[PDB]
Design an enzyme around this catalytic site. Structure first.
Site, mmCIF file in Angstrom:
data_model
loop_
_atom_site.group_PDB
_atom_site.id
_atom_site.type_symbol
_atom_site.label_atom_id
_atom_site.label_comp_id
_atom_site.label_asym_id
_atom_site.label_seq_id
_atom_site.Cartn_x
_atom_site.Cartn_y
_atom_site.Cartn_z
ATOM 1 N N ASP A 95 22.756 7.599 9.803
ATOM 2 C CA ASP A 95 23.808 6.580 9.842
ATOM 3 C C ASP A 95 25.150 7.243 10.056
ATOM 4 O O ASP A 95 25.991 6.699 10.778
ATOM 5 C CB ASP A 95 23.897 5.780 8.541
ATOM 6 C CG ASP A 95 23.092 4.492 8.609
ATOM 7 O OD1 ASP A 95 22.267 4.267 7.706
ATOM 8 O OD2 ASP A 95 23.279 3.720 9.591
ATOM 9 N N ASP A 122 13.858 4.270 12.053
ATOM 10 C CA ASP A 122 14.380 3.223 11.178
ATOM 11 C C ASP A 122 15.648 2.718 11.896
ATOM 12 O O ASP A 122 15.980 3.210 12.981
ATOM 13 C CB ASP A 122 14.699 3.790 9.774
ATOM 14 C CG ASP A 122 16.010 4.577 9.685
ATOM 15 O OD1 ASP A 122 16.280 5.400 10.589
ATOM 16 O OD2 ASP A 122 16.751 4.383 8.705
ATOM 17 N N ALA A 147 4.051 1.462 -0.895
ATOM 18 C CA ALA A 147 4.845 1.472 -2.134
ATOM 19 C C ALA A 147 4.012 2.013 -3.292
ATOM 20 O O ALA A 147 4.513 2.835 -4.062
ATOM 21 C CB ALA A 147 5.368 0.078 -2.455
ATOM 22 N N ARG A 169 16.627 0.572 -3.054
ATOM 23 C CA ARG A 169 17.806 0.606 -2.165
ATOM 24 C C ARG A 169 18.072 -0.824 -1.724
ATOM 25 O O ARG A 169 17.243 -1.427 -1.034
ATOM 26 C CB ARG A 169 17.644 1.527 -0.936
ATOM 27 C CG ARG A 169 18.938 1.521 -0.083
ATOM 28 C CD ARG A 169 19.055 2.715 0.868
ATOM 29 N NE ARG A 169 17.993 2.700 1.883
ATOM 30 C CZ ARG A 169 17.958 3.531 2.917
ATOM 31 N NH1 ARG A 169 18.927 4.422 3.094
ATOM 32 N NH2 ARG A 169 16.983 3.447 3.805
ATOM 33 N N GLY A 201 9.849 -2.690 9.978
ATOM 34 C CA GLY A 201 11.125 -1.978 9.979
ATOM 35 C C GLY A 201 11.131 -0.463 10.062
ATOM 36 O O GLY A 201 12.206 0.145 10.091
ATOM 37 N N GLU A 239 27.336 8.108 4.137
ATOM 38 C CA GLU A 239 26.755 7.929 5.475
ATOM 39 C C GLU A 239 27.653 7.196 6.445
ATOM 40 O O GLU A 239 27.187 6.685 7.468
ATOM 41 C CB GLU A 239 25.373 7.287 5.369
ATOM 42 C CG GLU A 239 25.352 5.811 4.959
ATOM 43 C CD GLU A 239 23.950 5.279 4.762
ATOM 44 O OE1 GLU A 239 23.781 4.282 4.023
ATOM 45 O OE2 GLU A 239 23.005 5.877 5.315
ATOM 46 N N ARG A 250 0.822 -1.213 0.000
ATOM 47 C CA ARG A 250 0.000 0.000 0.000
ATOM 48 C C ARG A 250 0.845 1.247 0.000
ATOM 49 O O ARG A 250 0.594 2.155 -0.800
ATOM 50 C CB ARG A 250 -0.994 0.009 1.169
ATOM 51 C CG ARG A 250 -2.143 -0.960 0.933
ATOM 52 C CD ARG A 250 -3.156 -0.997 2.066
ATOM 53 N NE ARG A 250 -4.024 -2.172 1.951
ATOM 54 C CZ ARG A 250 -5.169 -2.204 1.272
ATOM 55 N NH1 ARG A 250 -5.608 -1.119 0.645
ATOM 56 N NH2 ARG A 250 -5.880 -3.322 1.211
HETATM 57 O O1 LIG Z 1 20.178 9.104 7.402
HETATM 58 C C1 LIG Z 1 20.260 7.942 6.951
HETATM 59 O O2 LIG Z 1 21.150 7.138 7.328
HETATM 60 C C2 LIG Z 1 19.394 7.430 5.816
HETATM 61 O O3 LIG Z 1 19.726 6.236 5.228
HETATM 62 C C3 LIG Z 1 17.901 7.664 6.419
HETATM 63 C C4 LIG Z 1 16.883 6.652 6.335
HETATM 64 O O4 LIG Z 1 17.190 5.598 5.794
HETATM 65 C C5 LIG Z 1 15.474 6.748 6.852
HETATM 66 C C6 LIG Z 1 14.395 6.097 6.039
HETATM 67 C C7 LIG Z 1 12.993 6.174 6.562
HETATM 68 C C8 LIG Z 1 12.694 6.843 7.822
HETATM 69 C C9 LIG Z 1 13.697 7.484 8.616
HETATM 70 C C10 LIG Z 1 15.160 7.438 8.126
HETATM 71 MG MG LIG Z 2 21.353 5.319 6.155
#
Ligand SMILES: O=C(O)C(=O)CC(=O)c1ccccc1
Ligand SMILES: [Mg+2]
Ligand SMILES: [Mg+2]
Ligand SMILES: [Mg+2]
Length: 714
Positions: free
Chosen positions: A450, A621, A126, A329, A606, A422, A124
């Site tokens: 990250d 995340d 996506a 990704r 996730g 990152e 949904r």
């Molecule tokens: O800053 C980072 O490392 C990104 O890779 C951010 C990221 O993946 C993300 C995706 C969805 C919700 C919150 C952060």
């Molecule tokens: Mg990241």
């Protein structure tokens, strides 16, 4: 034993069947040749992939020891820089170069605009993301706090006309600022007409055209009374929907029903940080959604949008993309997954598998759906590769893509790379990282969350770090953001590749997003990350205000960050915190960790909105988890907090997370803490944090989620 033997590989039957029955048909790739190609790529590249992971561990052990061997006091930057150069962490900068990547879509090389990231396991979300290329400005303003809920303008079960009028006024002001009239304001418009191929706007007293008539891109319906008017500003489309019969249009001075903005220009279908996929069954669910997106038949009936038809100012016909241009990704170089095991029972590297499977599936997006091909018209496959450390790792990803293209029978360089900057070892060698991918690179993006996790882990032994909230203003991160833009512009990214910036995580704070996130295109970023189709529509307003192409031209040749600034460790000063401050930071980090981990381990979710200690809803995340767990691990390592403080905070926040949830599939953590796999996972992330490679959370999360599914199976 539910596995299929192919050479030295043992493939989970669910994955073998998915690939043969769903992914391969229609690609004209011979199934036997595909599988022999998988076996050969895995055998050939697995040693270099292991060697690179070993090099990360070796460099970290050397840095850790170097910090423990410091007698000082203020860190000697000259000695630190000389040490990093001697160990091969800091590599020489190559000579000036320009990227050669070709066959890239206009959404990437030219259009500046929002980029949406969505978990691929949620069909949904996506679907909504792929469809977010066009979004309603009226819905985004009405439904969020961009229009304040002051006395009179509050949302209720029914339409509030006082609030609706504020939405209309806000959009009229947006139009005046973006596509200005030669005289007067859009707020005074009574109608629109197309006369001799020119937009004529009726005001109460007179008629006017646009200050820049080239901003008129087209229309729908009759030229005498169009059903819509299509405008363009900074390469982004704006569509005014004219419908006096509608409820909103009836109340409007020119019968306007809505203002539609071209919003999520590109979307990243994520297999990484926003999803929980620990085995073949989970990977197949994701691969199948990616396949449905590329074939154009993913349906939840909610379906993918078709292209949009318009009449050109002159009268002829044209179309515009109805969907966001999709990237995928893949996971990074670290993890193995038991979806494929070798004869010894050893799991196969997940990144290798993702390149083969997502690359295979992406072929469908280059050919006619079931009408026109879904994705790239220029013939490229767009893959984002996260968490790479330095230019040898980028070189490895390029070799893997080359080997995958051979297996798939695709032209060399079909598989493009979105580089996440990152990890510290990438930041400090950024120019060499872009150079290693010079013919495949389509973007660089500062994955700041990250990057913060890596900053904490790398200098773990140096001393206690500043609070999580203080990180955004630290000298290292400000230099990191500027260095990223500088390296991309110097490599000729303007007009060729995206220079991207990070995610807005405060999902409900849209007024704050509209006020703050403008800093990113003002800093020369041609794209930045948004968490939802609503946030894409509102972040699109920034690209109408800021001329990113002009900003980038003005930044040409500047070198605003030095290596010393990039290397400034975010150590806290002595006596920086009172007890209440330490307790707030501990409780906040524990709540964030438990809130996220509980849904990850028990439900395989996730990405979750988790309210923080100040009741602010945050989209969490794995990267936000990496910061929280590494910060507490750092504070425990340097005596800022005791092990009793950590346990007590986890136990105190656990019932609060349980309350925030129940739900229905939710299993409470409190009171039997030692019987909760989710609680023990949260605890392990903190207490074993310093020992996780580069502070990565996946080894623990995957192990604990696999343990939860096993207990549920028995
Ligand atoms: O800053 C980072 O490392 C990104 O890779 C951010 C990221 O993946 C993300 C995706 C969805 C919700 C919150 C952060
Ligand atoms: Mg990241
Ligand atoms: Mg050690
Ligand atoms: Mg302008």
């Amino acid at each position: 034993t539910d596995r299929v033997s192919v050479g030295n590989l043992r493939i989970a039957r669910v994955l073998y069947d998915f690939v043969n029955n769903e992914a391969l048909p229609g690609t004209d790739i011979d199934p036997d040749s595909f599988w022999a190609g998988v076996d050969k790529v895995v055998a050939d590249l697995t040693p270099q992939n292991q060697a690179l992971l070993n090099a990360r561990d070796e460099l970290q052990a050397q840095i850790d020891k170097w910090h423990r061997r410091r007698v000082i006091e203020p860190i000697d930057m000259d000695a630190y820089r000389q040490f990093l150069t001697e160990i091969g962490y800091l590599l020489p900068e190559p000579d000036d170069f320009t990227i050669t990547t070709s066959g890239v879509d206009a959404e990437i090389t030219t259009t500046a605009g929002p980029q949406l990231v969505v978990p691929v396991l949620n069909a949904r979300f996506a679907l909504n993301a792929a469809n977010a290329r066009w979004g309603s400005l009226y819905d985004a303003l009405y439904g969020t706090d961009v229009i304040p809920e002051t006395d009179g303008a509050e949302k209720g079960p029914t339409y509030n006309k006082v609030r609706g009028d504020k939405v209309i006024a806000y959009a009229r002001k947006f139009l005046d600022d973006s596509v200005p009239l030669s005289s007067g304001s859009f707020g005074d418009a009574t109608g629109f007409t197309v006369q001799d191929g020119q937009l004529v706007v009726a005001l109460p007293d007179k008629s006017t055209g646009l200050a820049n008539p080239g901003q008129f891109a087209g229309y729908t319906g009759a030229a005498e009374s169009p059903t819509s008017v299509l405008l363009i500003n900074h390469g982004l489309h704006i569509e005014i929907l004219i419908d006096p019969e509608s409820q909103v249009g009836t109340t409007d001075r020119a019968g306007v029903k809505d203002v539609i903005l071209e919003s999520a220009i590109t979307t990243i279908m994520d297999f990484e940080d926003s999803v929980a996929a620990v085995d073949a069954a989970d990977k197949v669910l994701g691969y199948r959604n990616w396949l449905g997106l590329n074939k154009g038949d993913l349906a939840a009936l909610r379906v993918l949008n078709r292209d949009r038809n318009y009449t050109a100012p002159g009268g002829g016909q044209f179309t515009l993309p109805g969907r966001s241009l999709m990237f995928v990704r893949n996971v990074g170089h670290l993890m193995t997954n038991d979806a494929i095991v070798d004869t010894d029972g050893s799991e196969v590297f997940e990144g290798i598998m993702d390149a083969l499977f997502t690359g295979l599936i992406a072929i469908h997006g280059l050919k006619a759906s079931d009408g026109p091909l879904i994705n790239s018209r220029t013939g490229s496959i767009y893959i984002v590769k996260p968490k790479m450390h330095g230019p040898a790792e980028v070189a490895f990803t390029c070799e893997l893509f080359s080997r995958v293209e051979d297996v798939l029978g695709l032209p060399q360089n079909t598989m493009k790379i979105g580089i996440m900057d990152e990890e510290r070892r990438t930041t400090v060698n950024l120019k060499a990282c872009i150079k290693a991918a010079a013919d495949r690179v389509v973007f660089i993006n500062t994955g700041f969350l990250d990057r913060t996790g890596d900053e904490i882990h790398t200098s773990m032994e140096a001393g206690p770090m500043v609070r999580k909230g203080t990180m955004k203003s630290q000298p290292w991160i400000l230099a990191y953001e500027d260095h990223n833009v500088d390296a991309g512009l110097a490599a000729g990214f303007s007009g060729r590749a995206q220079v991207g910036k990070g995610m807005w995580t405060m999902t409900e704070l849209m007024a704050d997003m509209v006020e703050t996130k403008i800093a990113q295109p003002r800093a020369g970023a041609s794209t930045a990350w948004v968490p939802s189709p609503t946030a894409a529509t509102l972040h699109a307003l920034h690209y109408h205000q800021v001329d990113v192409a002009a900003v980038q031209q003005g930044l040409a040749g500047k070198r605003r960050a030095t290596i010393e600034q990039l290397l400034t460790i975010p150590l806290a000063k002595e006596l920086a915190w009172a007890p209440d401050e330490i307790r707030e930071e501990v409780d906040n980090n524990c709540q964030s960790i438990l809130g996220y981990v509980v849904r990850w381990v028990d439900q395989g979710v996730g990405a979750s909105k988790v309210p923080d200690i100040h009741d602010v809803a945050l989209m969490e995340d794995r990267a936000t988890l990496r910061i929280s767990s590494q910060l507490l691990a750092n504070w425990l390592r340097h005596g800022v907090i005791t092990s009793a403080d950590v346990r007590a905070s986890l136990e105190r926040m656990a019932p609060l997370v349980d309350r925030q949830n129940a739900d229905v599939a939710y299993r409470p953590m409190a009171p039997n803490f030692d019987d909760s796999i989710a609680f023990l996972a949260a605890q392990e992330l903190i207490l074993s944090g310093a020992q996780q490679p580069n502070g990565y959370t996946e080894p623990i999360l995957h192990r604990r989620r696999r343990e939860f599914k096993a207990r549920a199976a028995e």
